């Protein structure tokens, strides 16, 4: 009555298809009378352990809706930004403009901007 006993399994199958003994609402194999309508043959037998599917792979969508909930992201934000420099030095900071923005080293003879 245990599916994994008779066959191998994917080890993630729901306990429904691992335990087929819980399908109690199916036909009770009543003794057939002279008045046996053909239409009642539909779903008249409960499945056995062998009818259970080997593998199971649902189309899970939990993350989707919990992400697809509400609206979808859109930039009404203030377009704040800082233009960076063309140098990696945490001290020098020069861009396409303002190229004279750096630490001036220490000259000994000619003072600042001699020319």
């Amino acid at each position: 009555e245990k599916t994994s006993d008779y066959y191998r399994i994917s080890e993630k199958l729901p306990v429904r298809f691992n335990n087929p003994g819980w399908f109690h609402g199916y036909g009770t194999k009543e003794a057939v009378s002279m008045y046996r309508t053909s239409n009642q043959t539909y779903g008249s037998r409960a499945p056995t352990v062998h009818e259970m599917p080997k593998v199971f792979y649902p189309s899970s969508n939990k993350f989707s809706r919990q992400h697809a909930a509400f609206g979808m992201f859109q930039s009404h934000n203030i377009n704040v930004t800082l233009e960076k420099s063309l140098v990696t030095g945490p001290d020098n900071h020069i861009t396409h403009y303002d190229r004279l923005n750096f630490h001036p080293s220490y000259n000994v003879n000619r003072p600042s901007i001699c020319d």
Partner: protein, 51 residues
């Protein structure tokens, strides 16, 4: 070089257990489902008679 060969050798040594093992249950699952069907076949034949 030897470690590379050692890594090279062990990988080849593998993947053979994978091939061989799959074959047996293929035979097993075949045979198990085979026996079910004769049991199934005698069932309907049994069912026919009291009908």
């Amino acid at each position: 070089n030897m470690k590379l060969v050692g890594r090279a050798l062990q990988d080849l040594q593998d993947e053979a257990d994978k091939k061989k093992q799959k074959r047996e249950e293929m035979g097993r699952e075949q045979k198990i489902y085979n026996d079910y069907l004769m049991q199934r076949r005698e069932e309907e034949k049994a069912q026919e008679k009291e009908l």
